[PDB]
Design a protein around this ligand. Sequence first.
Ligand SMILES: Nc1ncnc2c1ncn2[C@@H]1O[C@H](COP(=O)(O)O)[C@@H](O)[C@H]1O
Length: 317
Amino acid sequence: SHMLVIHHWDTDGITSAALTIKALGLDDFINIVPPIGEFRFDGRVKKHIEEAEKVYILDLNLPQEVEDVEKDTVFIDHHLQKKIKNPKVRQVNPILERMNGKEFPSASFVVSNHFSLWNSWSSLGAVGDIGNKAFEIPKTLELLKTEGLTKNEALKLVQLIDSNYITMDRSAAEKAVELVLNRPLKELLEYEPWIKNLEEIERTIKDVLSGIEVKNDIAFIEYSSPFNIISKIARKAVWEMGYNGAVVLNRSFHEKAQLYFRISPDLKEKIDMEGIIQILKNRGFNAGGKSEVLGIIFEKNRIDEVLGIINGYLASL
Ligand SMILES: Nc1ncnc2c1ncn2[C@@H]1O[C@H](COP(=O)(O)O)[C@@H](O)[C@H]1O
């Protein structure tokens, strides 16, 4: 009786949701996100699934939860993940399907290719996942050009849209899909509620950047905060400050710990980020990522365990 669209909480997932909603010609939909930084379906998500008729899951590297879905489901993602056995799920992943993953930098590009619907939201998703490197793909700037948007304007839009999930606002992150659907991107650059979020986030990121240390050109950044800034801290440490690797640890993310391990393409060969994921998953950790980035949420008492595993690989550099 309803159309459900579960999607990631960042720009990549929010643009993917808008692209999916537009391509399907939906006039009656429910779009939700799982709890930020929990990487699992909670009660709220599970109830919507039972009520909805068809479900779309976008940019959510959590197959173990999709495996149990008893609805007709299309699962689109670009993370490195395991093949889903559930027959009710139609998995669309241009990594499992063996195709090149550099052709698909973000879920937005995967969704666009899936529906053959290319607009500026396609670009935003790419910028929200690989940042400035998305502009080295000609499709990005060209689509941004139609809407008369500059490089910086899209980078600013990623910060504004991301500002919702960083501030832990499930409702504002979900509503961002309606605003992208119903307002030009260049209008949302003026959207005051997002702007107010971003001012408080930059101010608090500077604090974490002040207490960073370094070894072997690897940045070790430890902090405690309820904001989900761990994604940007790892990027800022590697992408902007130029370090070869960043290990970011949040000790008090809402009664749980949170660690991120991002490397530069230079170390992408020397470090097997895929293997480190499997080792963490085998050990019962809620871990996922890509070939250059690591994300974990776990119990506070396993912080030393996690650090030992990663300092393990870091010791062979
Ligand atoms: N516990 C987890 N389970 C599955 N995927 C994760 C997890 N933690 C982080 N990720 C993914 O890792 C990617 C890298 O984060 P980021 O560098 O901020 O884009 C993100 O797209 C996350 O979705």
